[PDB]
Amino acid sequence: PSDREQPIRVQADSAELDDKQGVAVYRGDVVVTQGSTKLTGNTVTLKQDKNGEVVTSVGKPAYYEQKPAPDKDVTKAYGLTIQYFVTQNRVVLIDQAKVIQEGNTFEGEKIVYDTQRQIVNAGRATGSQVTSPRPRIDMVIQP
Length: 143
Hints:
Layout: E1 9-11, E2 14-18, E3 23-34, E4 37-47, E5 54-66, E6 75-85, E7 90-101, E8 104-114, E9 120-123, E10 138-140
Antiparallel strand pairs: 1-3, 2-3, 3-4, 4-5, 5-6, 6-7, 7-8, 8-9, 8-10
Keywords: Periplasm, Signal, Transport
Family: Belongs to the LptA family.
GO molecular function, one term: glycolipid transfer activity
């Protein structure tokens, strides 16, 4: 809901901003927060669009955290590469893609996450050439 009208704060060791290109890169224990949303990583790049469009994080692994309802349903997300398409409300996890929602653990080569519809897709990384091949996904629902 309100994870987008709030300001984006970034904390790192270093940053470089190309206001001409509209691209910013942050390095060193990078933490970007937007309300309840959180992205971490070794290296984070923000790309700017006409009026605001994607936050790409890379780590071992990169981490996404978010809260959909005000209740205690915090969703964790892990991936070698994570892209947060903020205009699209889409978070794509590549290469060891994991998602922990309420005891339910999700694993795959590639996981796409709609933060609005709260829809989680899991499958293979078509044309991303993963370092950890995983042609089959795993799912666990904890009782």
